[PDB]
Structures are given as C-alpha cells and as structure tokens.
Structure 1
C-alpha cells in the first residue's frame, strides 16, 4: 500500500497547511461580546475584530494587544502570534520535504524530516492554542477559524505518523 500511503501523506500535507493558514488569515477565532470603533456582538481573530450585527457591522479594528516579566512575555508572544505562524512555516517546509521526496529517491532521510517537520508543527500549534486561550482570559464561544486550527493539528500529527511509517518500511526492507 506504498502508493496510497504517499497519497495520504501528500493530500494530508496540503490539507494541514491549507486548514491552518486559513485560521491565521481569517478573523473568526472567537465570538465575544466586544466593541468596534456602545457594546456589540463581535467576532475577533488573531489580528482584527469586527462587529457581527448593527449599524457598525463590518467595521473592523486591529486588536490592541498591549494595555512584570511573567505577563509581559506572555502577551509579547501572543502579540506577534509567533507560535501559530511558526507552525505554518514548519508545515510549509514539511510539505516541501514530502514533495521533494518523490523528486529525489537517492536519500530516504528526506521523508523522515517531513515527519519531524509535521510532528514539530503540531506541537507549535498546541502552544499557540494554549497561549491564545490564556491571553484571551486576561460569555464567549470559538468560531470556525479556531476549530480550523485545531483540525489542522490532528491532520499534521497523523501525516507525521504516516511519514515515519513510510521511512521505517523503506529502511526495514533494505536491511531485511
């Protein structure tokens, strides 16, 4: 099933990169009771918050992250969203390693790096989730963008597991 195993990896690699990169770009992470400029239902993403109903519907503003090292470092990380963006770059490199694996069969270690890239990408996304939730607290519900990011974590880990499985199968048949 080597053909379908690589097909699962390349399809999953694109979906993991696609699902997470939409979460960063869109502005529907949290549905909170906020204000855009009176208080109005608003939908806030990682960078901009916009009203959901009323006269000022569609008027978005940049999220102001800043209003003592313990809490300064927490909001500094959340301000630039280092972890959610970092996992996007790791997912991007992992996809390149998977695609380049088929374009160069000389070294089998390239697909191993794709598994490590995707496994590391998932870990960076959990930190982005924990940092975002923790900084948000300092009535609400999470929108599709937040669930888009969480679904990108499951896909990235499963592709990472399968990518290592291909490398293990490739090396085991050579040695045995």
Structure 2
C-alpha cells in the first residue's frame, strides 16, 4: 500500500543511515593483533584509530597511519593513490552523505505530492550510496591486504548496504506506481 510503502521506505532509510553512521564512527571493524602507542597484543581497528584490547595498556587508542613512510618508499603511484583513498574514507563518507540526501528527498516528497521527481532522486541517491559503500568495502579490504577477523562495525556497513539497496528498490517501485496512476487517470 501507498502509506505502508512510505512507512517501510522511511524506516529502511533511517535504519541504513544509522547503521552507516555507527559503522563509520565506531572502531570495531577489524580484529588484529598489533603494536600499541606507536609488544604484540590483540587490538581492534576501525577507519581512524586502533584501540588496544585485553593488554597491559588496554583502552588506549592509537590513530591509524595509512602512510607508513618509515622506510621512505614510494613503489608505484597506484599504491599511493589507494593509500590516499583509504585514508580519507572518502567512499564510506560519500555513502553516508548520499543516504542522508536520499532521506532528505524522502522527507520532502510528502510536502510536494505533484513533483514525483523527488522520489526518483531519493532512489537514485540510495543506489549510489550502496555503490559507494561497495567501493569503500573493496578499498578497505584491499588496503588491509596491502589471523584476523571482522567485527560488528564492519558488518553494520554490510547490512546497511543491503538495506539501502532494498529501499532504493522500494522508492523506484513507488515512482513507477505514481506515473502509472497519473497515466491511468488521464486514460479516463
């Protein structure tokens, strides 16, 4: 139903935005043993800083350095570009921003019932947010490659992508119904 479709779209958009905002801000992305305050101790790392766990200095968090220039090595420009892209977290942040603008479009769709292009814009923003989340996940994993486990914060972004893509389907379906309804009325 139209009302239930709006309610589901809003709930899913809010859930996806909240999940991405939590995932980007939280530090439980990767479980890996590493040094502290730069010995070997198990820590958990996010996108900005890694917090040492169950160690003598547990609780303290060290800002992750994405440019280990200790040996003053450059290699190829592709590695530098990947490091720069991963360090800024440009793609997870872009996904969060796109989710926020899609939510804004969804909220503003109620005010203007005649302008149906806002629903389409919200759906486009949701799909683009999912794609940006995908690129961010790929870049993050590739940078980590260049024992370990993934924490709940990482899976929050993964679950947000599935929710954001599902809402994008709902929004375009709602846009499809709106134009069909307009065509149906013109038929009479």
Cα distance between partner residues in 1 of 2:91 and 2:105 = 21
User: 5+ residue gaps in structure 2?
Assistant: 69-75
Q: Which moved more, 1:47-56 or 1:115-124?
A: 47-56
Equivalent in the alignment of 1:46: 47
- Counterpart in the other structure of 2:64: 63
Other-structure match for 2:2: 2
Residue 20 in structure 1 maps to residue 20 in structure 2: yes
Whole-Å separation in 2 of the counterparts to 1:51 and 1:76: 24
TM-score, reference length from structure 1: 0.98
- In the alignment, the residues of structure 1 paired with residue 107 and residue 126 of structure 2 have an alpha-carbon distance, to the nearest angstrom, of 13
Q: Deviations over 1:118-167 (max 9, x none)?
A: 00100000000000000001110000000000000000000000000001
- Of 118, 123, 128 in structure 2, the residue corresponding to residue 110 of structure 1 is 118
Number of residues of Structure 1 aligned to a counterpart in Structure 2:
176
Q: What is the alpha-carbon distance in structure 2 between the residues aligned to residue 89 and residue 107 of structure 1?
A: 23
In the TM superposition, 1:1-176 aligns within 5 A as 1-37=1-37, 38-67=39-68, 68-176=76-184
1:49-108 Cα offsets, whole Å, 9 max, x none, are 011102100010100000121111011000101001000000000000000001221200
For 1:65, what is the secondary structure of its paired residue? coil
User: Which structure would you say has the larger Rg?
Assistant: 2
1:58 aligned counterpart, secondary structure = coil
For 1:131 and 1:161, locate their aligned partners in 2 and report how far apart those are by CA, in whole Å: 25
| TM-score of the two chains, using structure 2 as the length reference | 0.92
Question: Which of structure 1's runs of 4+ aligned residues deviate more than 6 A?
Answer: none
Q: Distance in 2 between matches of 1:41 and 1:69?
A: 32
